[PDB]
Amino acid sequence: EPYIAWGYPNLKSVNELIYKRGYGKINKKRIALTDNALIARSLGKYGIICMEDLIH
Amino acid sequence: TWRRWHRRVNTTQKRYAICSALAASALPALVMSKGHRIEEVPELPLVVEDKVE
Amino acid sequence: ACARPLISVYSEKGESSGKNVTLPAVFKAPIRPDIVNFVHTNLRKNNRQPYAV
Amino acid sequence: GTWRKAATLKSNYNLPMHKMLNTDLSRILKSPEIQRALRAPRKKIHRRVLKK
Amino acid sequence: GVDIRHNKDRKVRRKEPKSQDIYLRLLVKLYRFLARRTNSTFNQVVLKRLFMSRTNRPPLSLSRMIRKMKLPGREGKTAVVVGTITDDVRVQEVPKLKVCALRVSSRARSRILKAGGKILTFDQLALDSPKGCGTVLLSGPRKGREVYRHFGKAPGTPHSHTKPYVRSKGRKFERARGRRASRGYKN
Amino acid sequence: AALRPLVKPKIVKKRTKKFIRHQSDRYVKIKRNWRKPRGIDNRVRRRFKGQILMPNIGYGSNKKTKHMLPSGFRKFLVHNVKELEVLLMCNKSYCAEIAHNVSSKNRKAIVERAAQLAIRVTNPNARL
Amino acid sequence: SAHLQWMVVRNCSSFLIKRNKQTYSTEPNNLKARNSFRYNGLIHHKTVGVEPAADGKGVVVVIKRRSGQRKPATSYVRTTINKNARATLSSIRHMIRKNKYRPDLRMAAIRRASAILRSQKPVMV
Amino acid sequence: PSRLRKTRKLRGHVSHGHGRIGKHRKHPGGRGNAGGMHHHRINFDKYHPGYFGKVGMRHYHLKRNQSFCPTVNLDKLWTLVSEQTRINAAKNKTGAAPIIDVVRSGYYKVLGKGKLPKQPVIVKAKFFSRRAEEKIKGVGGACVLVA
RNA sequence: AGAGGGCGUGAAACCGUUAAGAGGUAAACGGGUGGGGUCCGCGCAGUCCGCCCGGAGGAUUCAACCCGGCGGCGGGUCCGG
RNA sequence: UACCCACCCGACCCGUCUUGAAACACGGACCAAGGAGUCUAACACGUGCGCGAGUCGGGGGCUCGCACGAAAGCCGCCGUG
RNA sequence: CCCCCGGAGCCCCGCGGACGCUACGCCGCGACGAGUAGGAGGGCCGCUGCGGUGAGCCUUGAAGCCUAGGGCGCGGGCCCG
Ligand SMILES: [Mg+2]
Ligand SMILES: [Mg+2]
Ligand SMILES: [Mg+2]
Ligand SMILES: [Mg+2]
């Protein structure tokens, strides 16, 4: 606790983080989430197919 | 004075250093690439008559 | 074990005499400069006199 | 010495063998045997995308 | 302001043959090509072996090559050794084999051909089966070098038998304090 | 108006000043050539404040404009005439520099053979 | 084989010149002097060369014959072309291509032809 | 060569690879293998077990030629002979059992290691092993002694 | 003889004088500029060139096409050897 | 960028032993040239190359007055070891 | 019928392949970059000498030395006037 600062985020806070500062770990790389064929290419086996499905 | 001046090679090693030495005496690319001005020589494994002896 | 062509003997004055030998199988041996170089350096050391103080 | 015969002037010696025969690989690499069994290339060099 | 140990982030494996022999550098140029392209992990092992040292791709005796080809099913395939095939004087019934290797000692070369066999090199193997189809990869025993005997715990630690370096073995060379229970102790 | 380059980029140089050796000013026995100080209590090697700068790699020139003259061409130390026709093709990218110890007679012959096939020479009006 | 020689000649050649952070090859009838594999004169068995004519005007086109190599006296045929810098170019063009004779040099041969002619005309003001 | 020596790369390095706390003084441990009992014991006892002390029985003026005795295993017996004398057998329908003079190939003893081909033999040696007896006998063949 | 009898070359420390600039916190130094110099690149417009095209001027011979010859390339009938 | 000068900010003298050096710790006026991990033998492991249950290498021998040679080549010597 | 790239006219072209391909070359992504003692790697960093090689350079001026002369390299140093 003396090192962190945590709390309960609201929806707009989830969007802002995921869009503006959201990078996906693909092949152990920080690759920017520019198009959602990069999200489906990693998470498609879970019904997650788009930038919006990530946020669910 | 007793620095190990002289060196050694296996017998077959220094025999097979002669094969590759000879096999490259053909192949004008390798020969000319040593700057041996072979541009008019009729053939590279140049054999001459035994009058020359 | 490659194919070996027919090397022509030249007369003492240029042009090609009828005699025609063969390429002796040495000239198909593997080129290996890594071995020519190595064997050369370890042999050229031998013709050399001790310098000392 | 030749290949399939002794030296007959040196005691026991024959030419060295080859680590490989067809020392050219430009012909090996475009023979139909090799060409047929190849994954198709990937040459759409992907300049990195600026994140807007 | 990141907190990873960079201790062992650089991976120490050979990515090119440390040797200069143009021939090995040439069929490395061949499987630097096949390895990237064809789905066969076969050449990815063949390539990753053409890098290794003499001390690490040991010779394969001819008899150890028989009993690994005599096993039920691997008939008709080709033995593939990134190394040399030596001879085995203590074996006589030489079945017909199809072998590939970098080198084959001259004596073992005549035992194989006389038995109606065939030996290839790693470039004809590329034309036989570029995917490595119908092959058997083998090697000599890498824990075969006499060096591997001096390795281990220690000589003189409890019941850990490891050969010690001695200038010459004999009666009076290291059978004393530590070896016979009568003279000091023993381990 | 001689021999424009193929591409004349914007050449930027992260540091333009030399890297003199520590204390190369107080003493004459010390040249300006860089030597990496290795003192225990030395104040440059522990990169203190307001001290002379230690050269390191992230200090180095752009990969495109590296070794590039202010005109655009890389130098080639041409030594005689036959070593000029090497540049016959790689000419709009880099140019010819005649060696110091070339005699004044053929130092001319190198010049006008270059002006024949358009190889800019950086020291073309030199000996005379 | 070509790939064999290139491993003996990559370094260690009497035509290789390495200075001033470049490398170069002064060997005969290689286009643009590149110490290369494609652009090499001896290593190969079909080579195209382009050098000025000895007269001062024209362009001579070296083609290796490949009929028999290790015959350097005749293995290696030349020809002359003294024409109008547009047919001149279209001669080496039709000679390399639609002959399937090393269509790697195809463009590098032309850019060497053109740069030869630019070197034989009124020099300067 | 001097060219590829770490002593080149140690120029401008003050201590020259030997550390400035404890310098490279001349002889810190001792000279040679000195102190096996004292202060080097952990080495001699954990890496050279059995170094220190007498054992066994003195035999003054030993000579090796007295007790010279090389060995063959049955593993490689048909190697001493040209392999054609083996092929001129397993055939010939007479029980030829060619003679192998292990003395002529320089071995005063035959030991019983390894398989033996199903083939009659006569092995002339000096000293036999018991199992080397049974391996030759059981294959069909004789063990003949030579002085 | 800017090789003069311990005389080839003739460095640095150090000193002499000429030139230029400075000068109460010993000097020296790192970063950043500014001012002045010695020169260096220029220009007595540096408007840099290179295609292709269009237009207007002026000049020599062809390319396109066939015909004679030479020389290659590749090809297959592996046809003949 | 480098010569001189100016300014604002920064800035203690290096080498060394040291828990700690700008130290009221020691070496150091300045400048030139010289100047310190070498060779031999013996192990050990790693690596490259030849050959591979073998493989040598020495001493000898056979071939030169060496120009290059006191080299290279060869020898049931090659296994006496 | 739905035909041939010696021509579909080409954002895909598997019929032939870059300028690019020094294949120990070139290229695209990411991540990361304190350092004594010490280790390792790379040094078209430097000094002297030999076997090669540069149809190298040189009395139309080599080595060395000197330079407020133009520059290149992160730098070792280097090239020019
Ligand atoms: Mg250090
Ligand atoms: Mg010390
Ligand atoms: Mg004088
Ligand atoms: Mg004087």
Ligand SMILES: [Mg+2]
């Ligand atoms: Mg004054």
Ligand SMILES: [Mg+2]
């Ligand atoms: Mg104290």
Ligand SMILES: [Mg+2]
């Ligand atoms: Mg005090």
Ligand SMILES: [Mg+2]
């Ligand atoms: Mg003291």
Ligand SMILES: [Mg+2]
């Ligand atoms: Mg670091």
Ligand SMILES: [Mg+2]
């Ligand atoms: Mg000198």
